[model samples]
Target: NIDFDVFKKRIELLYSKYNEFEGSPNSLLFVLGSSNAENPYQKTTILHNWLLSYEFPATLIALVPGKVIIITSSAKAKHLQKAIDLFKDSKITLELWQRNNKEPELNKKLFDDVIALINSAGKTVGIPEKDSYQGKFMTEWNPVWEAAVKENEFNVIDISLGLSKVWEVKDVNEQAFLSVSSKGSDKFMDLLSNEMVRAVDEELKITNAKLSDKIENKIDDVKFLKQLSPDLSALCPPNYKFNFDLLDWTYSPIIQSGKKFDLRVSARSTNDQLYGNGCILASCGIRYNNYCSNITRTFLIDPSEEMANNYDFLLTLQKEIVTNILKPGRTPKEVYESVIEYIEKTKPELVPNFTKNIGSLIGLEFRDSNFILNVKNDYRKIQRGDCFNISFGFNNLKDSQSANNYALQLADTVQIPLDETEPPRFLTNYTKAKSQISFYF
Candidate 1:
């Protein structure tokens, strides 16, 4: 048996904050779902986690008897499995009801019927006190409905409220039970059994424990980057220095005449005295009869073409790395180590080059920021769609090659807090709706 002492600590934390907030500990857990997206697994996992966290601290998980009801989003086997997992070892019964699809008509019927049933149950058994009846209804309900339709032979749409006759039946013990709707009777019994309880006490402990000050600082840093977005846009060129200079020179008649009719020409000039030649720098010059223009282009080029190609190749590498590393109950350290090994084997040449430029583990901040090639950070664990920006390019040793560089400052910002029921969400200006372009070459 796993030691649940961590769970004990979390309960202590919760109780310490209990008077800080108002509400019963028994939160009505509803697993609402949707099949519209390709991956609905996260929803199930989150709901499972929620239940585990709740029960871990309790001596015996108890729902106020007769006040507990569970309605799933879909009748899918997975949803049922999640329900069983959540309720296993906890002597609690869940009244399950579902809709056939998310179509407004069917959903209206499903909700109206369940509401009426709950109201009716209240009338008969009596509504529990407001403080005690912590009702949770699913906003995403279509998944449960589809599952019920496939697993059962009844047409769920035919069930009507305020008009239709309620079908009544007796269990094996001759206890009278009302079906009152299509497939609800069968679903009710199927929903009653418990599942094999996997110990999630450790998982809960780590999650709660890690939600402290350090995480807050990392989050705040991200927020700071977000706040700087507007200032950055003002400070940086509209495009990468290379692109801006290319367009600028192409439009100038003096630079355009030296080429074939179909050829293109671009140039830029900048005073040599300003700007450093490190990771973040750009400079340029042009001269005529006592008339000279000096412009600077900022570009952080990869030291080699091979490095450039490796950056392009990383899209596939990252996906495979994440898929391989991801598993239930995996520690951040474990995942980070796996990412390092994967990168080394996949791009040995690039790895050594990065090590030379920026020594790994024990290096100055400058080297660590731009040169470290190995993955050793806690955030090396990749989730889906984890995006990265790489600033890498090469400079020609001769022929007055233009130089340009761009630096990105990523941060998070606080937003107007929503309802106290939800976590405080951080704001970032990465909305898809906003029109913004990245000068990626």
Candidate 2:
């Protein structure tokens, strides 16, 4: 007979023991055959939630014929063994042999391999491999690897095991790019956007204050970039590196009609180096777990009436696109067309150098052809749970010709919510001027 009190005590002991060795580089993993229950997979969910309740990071890879593999830290292995032993007669047996490993990196690889194993197991048992374990395993295991990588200071031992692609993009052209898409929960999108917004806000708060105060006290632009680059990089989540390539730190002699405005801010970092060109454009891309979020916002350090008016108009136009046009069933190309039409009808004079592309879908890879918006693009409907970044603004080619070209971009990450009743959500809103600009003053 299974004793409930004993089971509770066992779990408590497991938590306590694991907490003692929480930071140790060790892991425990096991493969257990399914029970004879009507729906064996239900127990996997139950076990997963139970483990989660204890605050122990665990993953359940379910296989065919009611088999489930539980992977977690080695610190809790003995306690897990004791708890499972109590249900010896429950028709769930440790198949493929119960095991534990001292190497945390090995266990990380095991986590991925077990997932592939589960899919193979499904095939052997005549079950179709429908990517059943992919979403759950990715969601749970990503943070685990992230924590391990950060703890080891990016010197992660590459124990390549499973199908999940986790690595840094090394191409100079692609250094600041990451692509992410979610067919699962919107929670990851929420987490990602929150991080981007936080980082942007942090940099903006500091730079805006410095720029506003520089009218009286002039600070060195390159010096400011060097000091702030690391601070922004530190804001990235684990398994993420921050890069700002489109940063321009120029004393715009034209924005306020030659009033010596100090627009000193580093937008993003490339190879950890800060660029201080002092243009009005600030763009950043954060690569997280092989996924990417890109955001750009342009600030008029000291705006003339025309610059401020144009900024407000562009902000309103972008918000309109996000709120009205960006929705389920609308293709990115369609939205791009609408934005162009709207701009042409309202601000025809500024349409000459408006960005040809608005933005594209971001996920496992950035600039997936299917997600990009262009005149010649195929029809790819924007669906619920889709996460993407939309950027729209004008480039002052007139200004560029004289080495005083001004570019203004108002961009943010957005996710289409599952429920139509709920409006689309912004993952990053640092560009929203009313709140961000007022906060600086």
lDDT of 2 by residue, 1-441 (tens): 223343444334332332122132122222223232222222223233223212223434332223334555455454455555544553233322223444556656765566455434322211111212333335656675456435434322111111111111122112222222111012222222343334345553333333323321212355543554564455444544544432322121111112122222222222221112222444444433334455555544434446566777888888778777777777666888888888888888888868777877654334444457666554567766566667666765343223455556665666666566877666554435733431121
Q: What is the C-alpha RMSD, rounded to one decimal, of candidate 2?
A: 16.5
Backbone clashes counted, model 1: 28
Distance from true location, Cα of 212 in model 2, Å: 20
For each candidate, the alpha-carbon lDDT, in order, equals 0.25, 0.43
Off by over 4 Å in 1: 1-45, 48-68, 72-91, 98-405, 408-441
Residue-wise C-alpha lDDT for candidate 1, range 212-261, written one tens digit per residue: 22222232254543442343333222331111111111011111001111
lDDT value, residue 295 of candidate 1? 19
